[PDB]
Amino acid sequence: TQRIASHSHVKGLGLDESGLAKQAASGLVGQENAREACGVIVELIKSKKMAGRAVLLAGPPGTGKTALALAIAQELGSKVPFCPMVGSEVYSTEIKKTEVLMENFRRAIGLRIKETKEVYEGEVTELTPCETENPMGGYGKTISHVIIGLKTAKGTKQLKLDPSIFESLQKERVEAGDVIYIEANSGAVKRQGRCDTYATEFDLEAEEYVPLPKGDVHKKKEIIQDVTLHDLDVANARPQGGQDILSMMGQLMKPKKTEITDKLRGEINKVVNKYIDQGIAELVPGVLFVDEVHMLDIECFTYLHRALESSIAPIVIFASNRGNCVIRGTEDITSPHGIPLDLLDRVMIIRTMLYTPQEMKQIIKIRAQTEGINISEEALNHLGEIGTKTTLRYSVQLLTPANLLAKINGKDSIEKEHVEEISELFYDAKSSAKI
Amino acid sequence: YALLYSDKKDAPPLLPSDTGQGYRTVKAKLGSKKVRPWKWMPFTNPARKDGAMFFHWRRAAEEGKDYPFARFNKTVQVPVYSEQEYQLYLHDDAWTKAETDHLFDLSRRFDLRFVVIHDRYDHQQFKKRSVEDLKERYYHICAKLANVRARRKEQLERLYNRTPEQVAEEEYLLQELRKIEARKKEREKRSQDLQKLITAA
C-alpha cells in the first residue's frame, strides 16, 4: 500500500554539485536560500564535528518548512537517526517537560554496536580418548581432552576441546545426534535440538527438532545493532531477572519514565566511549526536528538553551510558524516567533519567502503527478489561480476529490469543470469567514 | 585463471555416482515397488537392409519398438545419373564413364569426404587426380544434373591458390620463419609508431 501521505514528493534538498539551488530540486521547488542553508547544515551534520547547535526554520505558513525539513532528513538517509517531535508532545502528565526533552535528545543520537562471535555447531559425536592418569600425581583414570565430532551440512570436523567443559555437556541433554551451539571463548554449550533428519512424521513434538547447520562448522557471525542512546537508557533503567518482578498489581504500572541525570550521563557515556575507542561501536549523532517550537513553555526554552550548551547534545532543527506572540507560560511577554529572545540568539534563522504563483503551479502539478492523476492545462491553471487567491495547501487537497469526481463522471483527466464544481462543494477558511 | 575445457578427462579428477546408501532410510521407499521384467529379446533394425536379426536388452512391455537408432541412417544427397545422361551431358575428354562412376561410388560410400576419396582413389585404373579436381568434377556434374532436371559456383582456381600457398608456408624453414616473425614484429612496431604520431598530432 503506497498510502501517499500529505507531502511525500520531497526526496532531498536537490542541490547541485556546486551547492547552489535549482527548481527541480528532487521534488521541492523554490526556496533557493533556504535550501542552500539546509545543505550547509546537513553538511555540518555529516561532518559530525559540532554538537548542541540549533537552527530555526522561521517563515510564514505554507512556506514548506516541514517539507524542507523532511527533505533534509531524507538527504541524511536512514543511516543516521531522525527523531521528529512537535512542541505539544513535550507536555506529559507523568514525566516532566525537561526530561522528555532530554529523552528526545537522546533518541536523536544514534549508536551502531558491532558484535562478532566465533561459534561451532553441528551434529555431535561425543567420545573421550582415554589418557593416562595425571602424570604429576599417581595413577588411575583421567581425561586430558574431550573430542566432539561436530558434523555440519558441508562436512565433518572433530574438535579436541578442553576437558573441563565435560560438565556443561552432561548438564544439558547433549546426546549423539543433536545440534549444539558452542562458543569459542566461553565454551558454554546450548543445545538447539535434534536434527530434522530424525524427526519421524509419527513423532509428536515441536521446538525439539531443528535442521542441520548450513556452512562450515566454524562460523564467525558478525552482527551490527543500531540503538539510540535513549534505548540504552531505558534498557539500563528497568530491572530484569527474578526479584519478584512477576507481580501484577504493584508492578503492572510500567510507565515510570522518570529519569535522573546521574544514570543518563556518567556511566552510560563512559561505557559508550569505551565501546567506541575499543572498536565495538561507532557513535552516530542524528538530528532532532522540533516543529511548533513556539508551543513550548518558557520552562522548556530555559532548559533548551542549557542542554544545547552540552557537548553531547545533537543538532536541533526548530521550525516556528507563528510570528510575534506572547511566550507560553509568561505574563504578556511578547517575543519574536513566540520564542524568548535569549534562545533566538543561539539559533540560526533560515528565512523562507512565499512561493511565487509559478512555484504554486509547479507544486500543484508535481503533487498531481505524485498522486497519479492527469490534469489538463486549463484545470492546472485554475488550480494555480485559486491557490494564489487562498492558501496554497487548499489547491493540493482539491486534486484527489476532483480526481474521484472525474472518474465517477466517466472521464479520466481532471477538467476545469471538475475543479470548478469542487471549489463550490468545498472551499477554504478565508471564504468560510463570512459568517 | 578461468573455467576448464576438457574432452575426456583431466589428471586427478573424479566423478560422483548415484546414491544407493541408507537402505534402512529407503527400505519402504523401494520395498513397495517391483522391477519391470527385462528380457534378452530379439530385435530387427529396419536399417539393416536385410533379413538379419539380433538381440538386445529391453523390457517385456515394449516387445515392439523396432529400433530407436534406425532414424539416424540419413544417406547423403548424391544424384544417380544413367548412362545416357552421362553420354549426353557429362561427356568429357580427360574423364571417362568408368572413372566418373568410380568417383560417384566412392563419394556415396564415404559421404562426400573428398579427402578419403582421394586417399582410397584407384590411381592404378585411372591416372592420378587431385582433391580439387575431384571436387570440381563432382560439383560440375551435380550442377549439370540439377539444371537438366529443371548449386553454387565452384572455382578450382581457388583451391589451386589455397593449398600450394599454405603448403609453402607450412614448409617454412626455421630460419626463414624466425625472419618472418621478426618482420611481423617490426611491422607491429611501425604500426605503434604511426599510432603515436597520429595521437601526438
Partner: protein, 106 residues
Amino acid sequence: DGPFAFRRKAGCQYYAPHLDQTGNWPWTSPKDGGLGDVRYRYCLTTLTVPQRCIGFARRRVGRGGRVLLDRAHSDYDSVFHHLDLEMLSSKDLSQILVNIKSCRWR
C-alpha cells in the same frame, strides 16, 4: 602481390581465416583454443543434499540412461571448497576473481 591473390571471386561464399591464434576442436577453451563448445565446459556447481562446492563439473549422460557429473582439478581444489560462502549468499577476493560467481544453484 604475386600470383596468390584474393582477386578471384564468383557467385559463392568464402570462409575467412583467423590470424595470430590457431584454434582447436570445439572441446578446447575459447581463450586458448577456439569455438569452445559449452558441451565440453567444466563449470563450478553446488550439489543438492551436500552444502560444499565440488569444484568445476559438467553434467553428462552415461550408459543405461544414468546421468553422471564429471569434475576437474584446478586452483589446488581447495579454494572452491571455501567458495560456498560466495555462492550461498587472500582466499576471499580470489574466489570472486577466478570466477564470475557463475556457480550452479541447486
